[PDB]
Amino acid sequence: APGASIFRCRQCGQTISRRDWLLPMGGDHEHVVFNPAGMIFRVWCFSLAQGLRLIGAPSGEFSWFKGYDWTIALCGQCGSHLGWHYEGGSQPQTFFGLIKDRLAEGPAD
């Protein structure tokens, strides 16, 4: 009966990822970053996620992760901006950077 197994969208409950899929990029699964508008994000990196909708074509502009291009990842249910999908890089080729405070963590179902 673990209570820290599954990450859901904090706004609607859509299943998004799992603690087991946490990915330590550059030695840490947590990355604190700012965008050009100055917003600060505490981003958790995951190997896999589901329940998202990836919007548009990838861009390398302002990428927080060297060698990766990003696409916006919205909750596929409610449209809440949950983070980004990264692609085009090496080891791994792709991963997800999701905004920790926009997810709710809980037991598996």
Give binding residues as ranges. Answer: 9, 12, 28, 30, 75, 78
Number of residues that bind Zn ion (CB under 5 A): 8
What six digits make up the tokens of 98?
């999701």
* Cα–Cα dist 109/103, whole Å: 16
On whether the CB atoms of residues 86 and 65 are closer than 8 A, the answer is yes
Q: How far is the CB of 41 from Cl ion (least distance, A)?
A: 7
Q: Would you count residue 80 as binding ligand EF2 (CB under 6 A)?
A: no
Three-state secondary-structure class, residue 100: helix
Three-state secondary-structure class, residue 68: coil
Stretch that binds ligand EF2, among 9-17, 18-26, 45-53, 57-65 (CB under 6 A): 57-65
Three-state secondary-structure class, residue 102: helix
Number of residues that bind Cl ion (CB under 5 A): 1
Choose the one of Zn ion, Cl ion, ligand EF2, none that binds residue 78, judging by a C-beta under 5 to 8 angstroms depending on kind.
Zn ion
Give the footprint of ligand EF2 on this chain (CB under 6 A).
35-37, 61-64, 70, 84
